[PDB]
Amino acid sequence: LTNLVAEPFAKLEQDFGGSIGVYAMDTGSGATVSYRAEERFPLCSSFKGFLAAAVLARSQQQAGLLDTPIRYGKNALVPWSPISEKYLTTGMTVAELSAAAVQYSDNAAANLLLKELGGPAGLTAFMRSIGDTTFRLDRWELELNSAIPGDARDTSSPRAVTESLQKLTLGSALAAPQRQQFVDWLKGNTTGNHRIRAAVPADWAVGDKTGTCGVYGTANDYAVVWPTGRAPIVLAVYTRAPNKDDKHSEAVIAAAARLALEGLG
């Protein structure tokens, strides 16, 4: 059954006018569904989930990190920073910046956290530390969104995203409290209701992080899903398309997720 999804994905790609990348893993079986699971796709804002996890990992060695106040100025602001804008007058703690980045995809917040962490190379090193050899972050918000076809900057594979997400949310890469905080942040995400969440029965708990580059039909979602009374499922859906003005589609990400889940039957 896991090998009967190729033609359904191909049709979806053809309808979409671009490329879809999927990796889904049932943590009960170990069983997987792949489709372009090894190809690079741009992360767009989906790197912010892993950023927050990296912050949490630092907090295991550094008490008082998460509650540290960051009083940023208006200069820290860039587009797509709805929470950072709203809290300009008060500042935000590292934890509040992390939640804004994950749950609202806040750009300014993500860049502030990158700066704490040693930049794109520092995040990349953290992902190496958990055994992810594919992930690379090269640039900052907003230029990491360029999504130029063939460009490996600021990309990973669906497989590596899912494997890394599993380690951090369900595996041993984070301490217990930190692990739960990561899961909670992903669970309260607000930007993903039309993506993997739309593909999942209403009764199942879901945590996710989205990404939207805004060019080259490039957008994505990754998630942990808790089917009632069963082992979690972890999955990643990434898209791109050949022309700069090709439109991304949330509906295609949801349909891709439904196929992957079906494939795990």
Ligand SMILES: *[B]([O])([O])[C]([C]N1[C]=C(C([O])=O)N=N1)[N]C(=O)[C]C1=[C][C]=[C]S1
């Ligand atoms: B992220 O994907 O790197 C970032 C912030 N963002 C936009 C969205 C969305 O459009 O739903 N989610 N998160 N992307 C950008 O800042 C580039 C843009 C995407 C759309 C307009 S600008």
